[PDB]
Design a protein around this ligand. Structure first.
Ligand SMILES: Nc1ncnc2c1ncn2[C@@H]1O[C@H](COP(=O)(O)OP(=O)(O)OP(O)(O)=S)[C@@H](O)[C@H]1O
Lengths: 580, 585, 79, 534
């Protein structure tokens, strides 16, 4: 079967061409060792060993490796002899775009089962290594043996890690030499199922994962990925990680676009961004452009054009942060569920954690690591300690967070608007003092912050009479272009876009600010009770960028006047209200 | 023996014999060693000429160094102990000077390259003590001599596996009589597996053997090339099952870029680049367009742009004989609208220019901006915490939010600047750490934006020296009329929709090509100019401190460096004094 | 895997202030308050669950100590 | 393998070299070897310091009639073996008369030796019709003093032995070389008796067994090898006896760098020293001293695990000590050159701060400070600090911080700081009651570092007068007493203090008198000697 399979992998040719040999020969010389071979080929070219692989991929994908590296030899070494010794072997990257099985499978029948699995990952990409061909010299018998662990690609990340202690004059005659024995640093990653998925089964689901050579940081949030399902086990803990059924895996990790491998609709949105929500056109436009994203430009200048830097949306419960967070999450890739001082199992600046997967301090991926793509939502925001105010302020000032602690010094990249809200102090003291004041008041914390807001839900006059019925309430009692479709338009504007602003509405905004300043330089003769006429110069560019995003809503390479003028009116209402 | 080692021996013999110049250089330093009645004899070699001669040797070196290098060791030992028979010395190779280009970030040196030549660039922090570990041991049999030699063949040797079996100490071996040891005669190879850390501007233990002992100071992103191998004991036979130790060898040490700033810039030039830079510099007008090169979002205050480009030039900081190296670099303070002035003017030096560690004052001090003696539970030992700025070498550190300094910080600015380096005498230790970096500071007006309106007396609450101790002091405008805000709007819109960055290759070029040391006519100008300064504007604030004149040199002398002019023009001095009038008025 | 029964009620209401050696190993129903609690334990429960009784199961048993593991042993849900 | 690589070094040839290398010498007039071996056999000496000058002189005489240093540059200890064992082989016996109650451990070991000699010449003779180690009869500890550069002047050789080098300069090949290093002593423990020849009496089998002291880790040897109880099914156990064995003093210390030998980069490094023999108690923490001996790592693994490796600890076996600052050499010849060059006073007054011109007077005072060099330890009474405490006053334009950099770069041992650079306890001293030996560790108070040097100080106005107590303490020089956290002891700092201050009103207050500008309470000025307001 070895020769038939060796030939059949030579014949593996998807509906494109014999790309897996020429591209192979032209890819080994620098980086691409083993080309990612999408596995729509095996389903038609050899159905017998296709069933064998869907049944027992443990001791078969090593034959895949052997045949693919052997044909890689037969081609690249021939081109070497035509152009200019060992040609170190490869670990192929095999998976398919069909027959999807997320972590819905957890049972024990899945020893040696490959399934085209998609799923999210949170953290614990820890690094370790295992040997490929094991070199063990005996001391009490002088017996040198180069016995492999019996595979290099499907190793635990069925291989038991004993070494058959021979004649026992000494406690360990057979001793490992790790120089002559070749090994691979394989990172011990973790696997979770996608929480944004209609098919759900076995609510407790979790497996391990391996990143062999370049499998690290190839999966990005929100993508329909194709990784290996599960592998046999050196049995885990039993009464590690979770106790029951924690195997080491042999994942190969193909990643591409959701739908591919190598191989006027807005007039219904005038209110549809809010199927049931009420008003607050300013905060709601903030929310729709938050779902949009704003501007992002790299072209030559002395900075990068930022978008939606900051909002202080602090407001009372009743606003139903439930529905806000749930709809944004359903539309966003992964809504960064930040809890005050903590990002994920650590603080805002990620804290290192001594994981027993490596039994060492690994940098626990922070919310920030998972925040590129989705808007940070800070709940429990009021009880946040003042000790890391400047920490978040620094992040707000740039984007990324520079986490530099014991052993780990990295500026981990984060790129999204903010969300700040909690139950305001003194009840509705926010009404008397500034729109801020959900947390401490000191004017220094407020410095880097940009925009403050108040939310209007359908309970305002319940403070005069309805409160009575309110306690009696205790006694006696989508319609829009889909969430995934908005995420799709957003990924297709991250791909390519140039919907810039328009000069005429730009000068209109410049007017409706400068002429305000001129009417008020004239009204200084009236000696206005406004404390100190401020420079509305960062809020102004904020409005400019929000009109830019409202133009991104309409693809116009020079902004249409409709969205820009609407945003202009609403943000002058907001700024004017703030001034009041 | 097997024929493969003999073939490799012959190939390396032919390779070294091809370049008899290096043979004679080794012979010369070796006859010097003999006349001195030595040096670890690994030769600085480049794997480039190998492609001209060695087609199988070079083929097997990079793929598997443990196979083709130990022959390149044995054959060299033979050829050299034949080159020198006089005295009675590893005769190895150091591989320094080749184009490895592997493992850009030491976080992933293990994945791609296994059992291969691996380069890694990373800071060398917490260097361990020297370990002059014995390998060659010599001994004496209590009777009749029998002076026994021993080579401690182990796994912890340089590259090859040497049967890691405990031969720590033989005694009474091969003879019934006693074996005494003999020290000194037996060599003690410098096993110093120093902890070199990573490089964040983009903690493996590298064993620096007998010549690379402490080649770099703490804060050096050393481009060390070694052989990524693995060895050791983990406990897969006893009860402890864990993995094993992976470790990179030590072959080459290309340290931090010495003459220019650190390794990251790499702003060498090509004939097209030299021609573009020359076509630029010879033109009198370019000095002004640099303002547009430093005015991407804000406009006006082009004099501040001039200041930025000057302090980017570097200055003429000169090393005076038998005395302190005078400060020729400049550090400029900025103060204005904390909202807009800081962000805009900063975002060049922060993101674009170079080597500008963002420093908020209290916060970005981190553990400490200056230093701190830290006795750690990890090794149970005390090292130093050199702040980023003092960890920096030659850069231009940006300190935003200056008014948020902790009290103890307020003194570092005096030593890091006026004494050019930070000397600390703290608990149990005293050391003069190098902090020679230009500084761009941006201080918030401690009360809103009245830094412009309120007089500088206690304005930032630091009028006494902290105001003047920074060389130049700049203030933007706050109260503007229709026209300035309108131009602001015009530009912010035309940007929300003249080479700025290339100038970097222009800057360093000057500071290594041409230097306007000084000119007597510019002296005759500036000295009388400064006498007028200290005679006329005295009533304002008396910032007339002679230190200012020092800057009046620095500034102008960097100007002509930006100008590339070999001389400090008198009108260069005019530009200097007018820049100062701008900073003063 | 296995089922253990539970009993409804007893008339014996020995308060915590009243417990005697006669009562031990018997059945008791007590009131009180949960002061504080722990997490799940994988309790141990030729030393089956002794780890203090090792007669001659050691290679260096005179004084050289032999080390037993604390795992591979049966674990009972234990709070 | 198991090589036996012949090297030019040998002991039998060195044995004959030692046989000829006897007492016989000319100036060493009776050779100092002879009279000093008498003295030690007259029991008034144990340290027979054998310098290296007379070694090269004996070599020169033997060569003119018909290398030792180059031989001791690797081991230096097989020489202490042969050399001493031959001083035993050539030991004047009848030097002086002997008593029985004139000493202890010299009549007692002679009693043991000669009585067991009677018992052996009787018992082995009855059977007819152990070896007392030379250490047991040492009663002296011999050392070597490195040669002065005089011999290398006339006969250049491997002079690296006598060349004072820093601990940083210790190359991997320098391990084993008789090396003289200088620095600062620290953490010198107290005298501890270490055994040399461990005795073992059985009390049943009689035979006093003597074993040799290995590395610090040793074993009390097992059941006897004595034949009194042996050759039967019985054997009486032996045990040690402190009187029967022999001990000797032992001490440890560490050395740090002169602070002008370390780069502007890395941290200074320490280095262990095991002081042995009668050289104990002749040391102290904080003295500039050239110590010399061998450089060895002893083999011992900490965790005692399987893998050994070599954790290369070190120690300078104390073969000789030179405590400087209690020359007739080229340096003094150039000194004569200077004294002849004239104007030396105003000469230095000009060459000081040779980067700045003006304010000559303050540079004059700085000259007077850096020279200092007076004192009055009146004897049977009050000491009097003969050091200088000069202070400044002015504005940044004076560049006084530059003057300080200048001076405490020019002064050896000098140190710089600021007023707020180090807290009170930071600048004076920080003590830790070491729990290991429950002893006192001094962690480098700026001042104690400053001992025998000039302490540069800036921003002395803002020094938080609650901290002015320490400095105020310094006027009473070379005594910093601290009685806190269970430790109540003093630490002396021979220091002269240079300060730099500012008028409180910024530049100056013309309207107000002096000493208003100078906020310093007069109880501080009075401690100062010169005030220079500028
Ligand atoms: N006579 C002089 N010769 C040379 N340079 C001088 C002279 N007088 C002043 N200077 C300059 O004055 C500058 C000011 O030095 P600073 O150290 O800032 O002053 P300072 O020592 O701090 O005075 P304080 O401590 O603030 S009162 C120095 O950089 C010198 O170059």
């Amino acid at each position: 079967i070895i020769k038939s399979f060796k030939n059949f992998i030579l014949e593996f040719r998807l509906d494109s061409q014999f790309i897996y040999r020429d591209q192979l020969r032209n890819n080994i010389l620098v980086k691409n060792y083993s080309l990612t071979v999408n596995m729509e080929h095996l389903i038609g070219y050899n159905e017998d060993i296709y069933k064998k692989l869907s049944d027992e991929p443990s001791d078969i994908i090593p034959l895949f490796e052997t045949a693919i590296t052997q044909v890689a030899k037969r081609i690249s070494i021939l081109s070497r002899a035509q152009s200019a010794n060992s040609l170190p072997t490869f670990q192929l990257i095999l998976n398919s775009n069909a027959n999807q099985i997320p972590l819905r499978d957890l049972d024990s029948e899945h020893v040696s089962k490959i399934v085209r699995l998609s799923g999210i990952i949170i953290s614990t990409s820890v690094l370790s290594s295992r040997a490929t061909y094991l070199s063990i010299m005996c001391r009490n018998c002088r017996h040198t043996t180069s016995i492999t662990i019996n595979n290099f690609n499907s190793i635990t990340g069925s291989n038991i890690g004993d070494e058959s202690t021979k004649k026992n004059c000494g406690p360990d005659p057979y001793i490992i030499i790790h120089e002559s024995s070749k090994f691979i640093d394989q990172q011990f990653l973790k696997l979770q199922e996608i929480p944004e998925l209609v098919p759900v089964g076995e609510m407790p689901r979790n497996l391990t994962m391996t990143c062999d050579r370049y499998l690290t940081n190839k999966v990005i949030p929100g993508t329909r990925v194709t990784i290996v399902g599960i592998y046999s086990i050196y049995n885990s803990k039993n009464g590690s990680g979770v106790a029951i059924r924690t195997p080491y895996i042999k994942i190969l990790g193909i990643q591409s676009d959701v739908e591919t491998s190598s191989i006027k609709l807005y007039e219904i949105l005038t209110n549809s961004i809010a199927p049931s929500i009420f008003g607050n056109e300013d905060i709601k436009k903030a929310i729709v452009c938050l779902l949009m994203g704003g501007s992002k430009k790299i072209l030559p200048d002395g900075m990068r054009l930022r978008g939606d830097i900051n909002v202080l949306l602090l407001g009372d419960p009743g606003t139903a942060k439930s529905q806000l967070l749930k709809f944004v999450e359903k539309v966003s890739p992964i809504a960064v569920y930040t809890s005050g001082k903590g990002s994920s199992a650590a603080g805002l600046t990620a804290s290192v954690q001594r994981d027993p997967m490596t039994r060492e301090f690994y940098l626990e991926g922070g919310a920030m690591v998972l925040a590129d793509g989705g808007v940070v939502c800070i709940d429990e925001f009021d009880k946040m300690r003042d000790e890391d105010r400047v920490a978040i302020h620094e992040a707000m000032e740039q984007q990324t967070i520079s986490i530099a602690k014991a052993g780990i010094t990295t500026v981990l990249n984060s790129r999204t608007s903010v969300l700040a809200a909690a139950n305001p102090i003194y009840g509705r003291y926010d009404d008397l003092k500034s729109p801020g004041d959900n947390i401490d008041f000191q004017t220094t914390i407020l410095s880097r912050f940009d925009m403050i807001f108040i939310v209007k839900d359908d309970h305002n006059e319940e403070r005069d009479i309805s409160i009575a019925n309110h306690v009696i309430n205790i006694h006696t009692g989508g319609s829009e272009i889909s969430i995934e479709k908005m995420k799709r338009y957003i990924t297709y504007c991250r791909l390519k876009c140039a919907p810039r602003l328009s000069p005429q509405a730009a000068e209109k905004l410049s007017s409706n600010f400068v002429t305000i300043r001129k009417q008020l330089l004239i009204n200084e003769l009236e000696s206005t009770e406004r404390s100190s006429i401020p420079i509305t110069i960062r809020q102004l560019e904020a409005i400019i960028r929000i009109t830019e995003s409202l133009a991104k809503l309409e693809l116009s390479p020079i902004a249409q006047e409709r969205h820009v003028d609407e945003a202009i009116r609403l943000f002058q209402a907001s700024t004017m209200d703030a001034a009041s | 023996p097997d024929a493969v080692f003999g073939d490799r021996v012959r190939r390396f013999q032919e390779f070294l014999d091809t370049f008899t110049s290096y043979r004679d250089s080794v012979r010369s330093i070796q006859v010097y060693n003999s006349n001195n009645a030595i040096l670890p004899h690994r030769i600085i070699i480049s794997l480039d000429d190998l492609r001209e001669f060695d087609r199988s040797f070079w083929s097997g070196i990079l793929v598997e160094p443990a196979y083709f290098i130990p022959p390149a060791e044995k054959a060299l030992t033979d050829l050299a102990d034949s080159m020198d028979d006089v005295p009675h010395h590893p005769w190895k190779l150091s591989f320094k000077g080749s184009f490895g280009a592997h493992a850009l970030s030491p976080r992933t040196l293990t994945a791609q390259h296994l059992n291969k030549l691996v380069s890694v660039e990373g800071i060398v922090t917490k260097t361990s003590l020297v370990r002059p570990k014995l390998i060659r041991s010599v001994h004496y049999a209590a009777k009749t001599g029998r002076f026994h030699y021993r080579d401690y063949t182990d796994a912890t040797t340089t590259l090859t596996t040497r049967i890691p079996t405990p031969a720590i100490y033989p005694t009474e071996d091969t003879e019934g009589n006693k074996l005494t040891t003999e020290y000194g005669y037996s060599t003690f190879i410098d096993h110093q597996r120093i902890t070199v850390q990573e490089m964040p501007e983009m903690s493996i233990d590298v064993i620096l053997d007998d010549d690379l002992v402490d080649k770099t100071k703490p804060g050096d992103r050393v481009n060390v090339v070694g052989v990524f191998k693995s060895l050791g004991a983990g406990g897969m036979n006893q009860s402890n099952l864990i993995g094993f130790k992976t470790l990179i060898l030590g072959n080459t040490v290309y340290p931090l870029h010495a003459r220019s700033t650190g390794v990251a810039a790499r702003q060498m030039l090509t004939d097209f680049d030299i021609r573009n830079i020359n076509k630029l510099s010879k033109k009198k007008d370019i000095f002004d367009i640099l303002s547009q090169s430093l005015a991407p979002s804000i406009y006006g205050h082009d004099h501040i742009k001039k200041a930025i480009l000057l302090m980017l030039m570097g200055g003429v900081e000169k090393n005076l004989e038998n005395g302190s190296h005078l400060r020729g670099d400049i550090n400029i303070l900025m103060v204005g609208d904390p909202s807009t002035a800081k962000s805009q003017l900063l975002r060049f030096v922060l993101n674009t220019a170079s080597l500008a560690i963002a420093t908020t004052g209290r916060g970005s001090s981190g553990v400490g901006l200056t230093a701190a003696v830290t006795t750690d539970r990890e090794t149970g030992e005390r090292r130093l915490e050199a702040g980023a700025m003092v960890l920096a070498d030659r850069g231009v550190v940006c300190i935003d939010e200056f008014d948020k300094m902790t009290d103890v910080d307020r003194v570092a600015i005096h030593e890091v600047m006026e004494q050019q380096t930070v000397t600390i005498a703290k608990a149990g230790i005293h050391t003069t750490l190098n902090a020679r970096c230009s500084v761009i500071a941006a201080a918030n007006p401690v009360f809103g934006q009245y830094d412009v309106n309120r007089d500088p007396h206690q304005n930032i609450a630091l009028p006494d020296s902290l105001l003047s101790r920074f060389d130049l002091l700049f203030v933007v405008t706050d109260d503007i009329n229709e026209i300035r805000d309108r131009s602001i709007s015009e530009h912010v819109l035309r940007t929300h929709r003249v080479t700025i960055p290339f100038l970097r290759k222009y800057v360093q070029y000057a500071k290594e090509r041409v230097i306007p040391q000084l000119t007597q006519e510019a002296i005759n100008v500036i000295v009388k100019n400064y006498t007028d300064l200290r005679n006329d504007d005295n009533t304002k604030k008396s910032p007339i401190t002679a230190r200012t004149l020092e800057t009046l040199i620095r500034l102008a002398t960097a100007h002509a460096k930006v100008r590339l002019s070999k001389t400090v023009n008198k009108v260069d001095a005019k530009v200097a004094a007018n820049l100062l009038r701008f900073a003063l008025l | 895997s296995e089922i253990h029964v539970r009993i409804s009620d007893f008339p014996t209401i020995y308060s915590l202030r009243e417990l005697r050696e006669s009562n031990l190993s018997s059945l008791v129903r007590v009131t009180g308050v949960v002061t504080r609690r722990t997490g799940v334990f994988p309790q141990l429960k030729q030393d089956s669950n002794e780890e203090i009784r090792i007669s001659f199961c050691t290679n260096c048993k005179s004084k050289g100590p032999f080390r037993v593991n604390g795992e591979k042993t049966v674990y009972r849900n234990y709070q | 393998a198991l090589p036996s690589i012949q090297l030019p070094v040998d002991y039998n040839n060195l044995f004959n070299e030692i046989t000829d290398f006897l007492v016989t010498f000319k100036q060493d007039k009776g050779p100092k070897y002879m009279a000093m071996l008498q003295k030690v056999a007259n029991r008034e000496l144990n340290s027979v310091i054998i310098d290296l000058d007379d070694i090269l002189q004996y070599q020169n005489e033997k060569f003119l009639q018909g290398d030792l240093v180059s031989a001791i540059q690797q081991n230096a200890n097989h020489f202490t073996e042969l050399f001493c064992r031959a001083i035993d082989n050539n030991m004047p016996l009848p030097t002086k008369e002997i008593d029985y109650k004139d000493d202890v451990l010299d009549v007692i070991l002679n009693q043991r030796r000669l009585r067991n000699e009677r018992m052996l010449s009787d018992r082995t003779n009855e059977i007819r019709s152990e070896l007392f180690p030379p250490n047991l009869t040492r009663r002296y500890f011999l050392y070597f003093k490195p040669l002065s550069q005089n011999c290398a002047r006339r006969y250049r050789k491997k002079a690296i032995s006598s060349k004072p080098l820093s601990v940083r300069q210790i190359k991997g090949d320098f391990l084993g070389q008789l090396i003289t290093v200088r620095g600062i002593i620290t953490r010198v423990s107290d005298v501890k008796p270490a055994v040399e020849v461990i005795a073992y009496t059985c009390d049943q089998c009689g035979y006093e067994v003597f074993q040799e002291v290995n590395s610090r880790t040793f074993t009390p040897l097992s059941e006897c090898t004595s034949e009194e109880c042996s050759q039967n099914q019985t054997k009486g156990q032996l045990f040690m006896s402190t009187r029967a064995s022999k001990f000797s003093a032992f001490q440890e210390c560490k050395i740090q760098e002169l602070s002008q030998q370390v780069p502007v980069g890395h941290i200074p490094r320490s280095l262990n020293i095991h002081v042995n023999g009668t050289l104990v108690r002749s040391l102290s923490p904080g003295d500039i001293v050239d110590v010399t001996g061998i450089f060895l790592p002893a083999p011992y693994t900490g965790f005692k695990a399987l893998k050994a490796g070599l954790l290369t600890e070190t120690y300078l076996e104390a073969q000789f000590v030179r405590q400087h600052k209690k020359l007739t050499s080229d340096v003094e010849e150039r000194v004569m050159e200077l004294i002849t060059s004239g104007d030396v006073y105003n000469r230095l007054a000009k060459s000081i701060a040779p980067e700045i011109y003006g304010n000559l007077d303050v540079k004059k005072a700085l000259l007077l400070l850096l020279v200092g060099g007076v004192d009055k330890r009146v004897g049977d009474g009050m000491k009097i600090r003969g050091d200088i405490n000069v202070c400044l006053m002015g504005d940044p334009g004076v560049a006084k911080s530059q003057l300080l950099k200048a001076i405490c770069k020019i002064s050896p041992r000098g140190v710089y700081t600021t007023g707020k650079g180090s807290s009170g306890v930071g600048l004076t001293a920080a003590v830790m009651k070491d729990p290991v030996t429950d002893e006192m560790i001094l962690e480098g108070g700026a001042l104690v570092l400053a001992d025998n040097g000039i302490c540069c100080i800036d921003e002395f106005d803002k020094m938080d007068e609650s901290d002015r107590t320490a400095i105020h303490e310094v006027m009473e020089q070379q005594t910093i007493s601290i009685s806190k956290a269970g430790i109540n002891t003093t630490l002396n700092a021979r220091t002269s203090i240079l300060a730099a201050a500012n008028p409180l009103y910024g530049r100056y207050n013309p309207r107000l008198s002096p000493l208003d500008n100078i906020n310093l309470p007069a109880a501080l000025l009075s401690r100062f000697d010169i005030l220079f307001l500028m």
